Amino acid sequence: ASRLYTLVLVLQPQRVLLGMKKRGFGAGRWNGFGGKVQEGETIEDGARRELQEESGLTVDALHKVGQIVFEFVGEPELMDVHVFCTDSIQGTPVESDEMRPCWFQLDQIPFKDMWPDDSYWFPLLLQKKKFHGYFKFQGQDTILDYTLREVDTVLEHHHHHH
Ligand SMILES: COc1c(O)cc2oc3cc4c(c(O)c3c(=O)c2c1CC=C(C)C)CCC(C)(C)O4
Ligand SMILES: [Zn+2]
Ligand SMILES: [Zn+2]
Ligand SMILES: [Zn+2]
């Protein structure tokens, strides 16, 4: 029982581009750019689509930095989140109806305004290290338990529908 998602972090030496959910689910929180991988699309096309729709940005390449598994108490279906980062972007960041991109200096990242798991794996991301992580949520604000480990290479899931 799982659903397939992507998350894209736009990362430059001194700054990260985040985006603010403007309405609906998760409104008021800054996040990377991502969403559900659609049927008929590959993981990486979905990551590119999320970034393009939400930030208006195109990228030359995505690095696979991480895999996050979310579990929500009472829900049997896990979220399988493929995490990517990109250094080199093309276009000017512009908001959609869903998301507004904004640059943040790395030491200014607004963790109180982001999802609670970000405080865990963001240090590994900014150190340019790959990771695998798991977070058990109760509601939106509460992590019941977590496992986070640095990895040498991101484990490939061999999704053959995506
Ligand atoms: C990657 O962005 C996140 C994230 O960091 C944490 C998230 O946590 C959630 C917890 C959650 C629920 C959630 O939908 C989330 C998240 O979606 C969530 C997300 C967003 C996931 C992506 C941008 C791929 C619904 C069930 C409930 C019991 C309310 O708990
Ligand atoms: Zn599928
Ligand atoms: Zn990167
Ligand atoms: Zn997967």
Side-chain angles (χ1 to χ4, degrees), residues 1-97 99-148 150-162:
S2 70
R3 14 266 286 150
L4 180 56
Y5 298 79
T6 59
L7 187 64
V8 181
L9 285 300
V10 178
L11 214 63
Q12 300 194 338
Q14 293 307 325
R15 60 181 191 173
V16 55
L17 188 79
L18 296 172
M20 158 58 72
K21 188 65 160 52
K22 290 171 57 187
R23 66 182 181 182
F25 183 79
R29 280 187 162 159
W30 299 94
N31 204 350
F33 302 99
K36 188 180 184 182
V37 180
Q38 299 167 358
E39 290 311 305
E41 82 176 352
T42 70
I43 290 174
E44 269 164 26
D45 283 347
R48 290 177 182 273
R49 180 183 50 73
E50 304 290 354
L51 180 71
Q52 200 291 309
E53 298 178 341
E54 305 171 3
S55 73
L57 292 183
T58 308
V59 289
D60 277 41
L62 294 170
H63 320 130
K64 304 169 46 175
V65 284
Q67 292 298 332
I68 302 180
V69 179
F70 291 145
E71 184 180 330
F72 322 105
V73 274
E75 300 292 344
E77 292 156 357
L78 313 174
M79 285 191 42
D80 168 20
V81 183
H82 288 240
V83 184
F84 301 90
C85 62
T86 180
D87 172 44
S88 305
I89 55 179
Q90 286 170 311
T92 77
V94 68
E95 61 193 277
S96 71
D97 294 327
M99 288 281 270
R100 177 173 307 106
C102 280
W103 287 107
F104 294 80
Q105 291 292 279
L106 293 183
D107 62 338
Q108 305 298 302
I109 292 177
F111 290 107
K112 65 176 188 183
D113 293 307
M114 298 157 75
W115 291 89
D117 58 297
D118 289 357
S119 294
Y120 295 71
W121 56 268
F122 256 73
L124 299 182
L125 175 81
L126 301 183
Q127 292 160 10
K128 320 299 288 181
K129 306 196 295 203
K130 304 166 186 184
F131 60 91
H132 282 352
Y134 163 80
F135 301 88
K136 183 197 246 286
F137 277 84
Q138 182 180 279
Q140 297 175 30
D141 305 327
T142 301
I143 288 170
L144 292 182
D145 195 32
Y146 74 102
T147 289
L148 181 58
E150 176 179 356
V151 297
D152 189 89
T153 172
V154 163
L155 276 289
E156 163 70 31
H157 290 174
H158 309 276
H159 295 285
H160 72 258
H161 298 261
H162 304 272

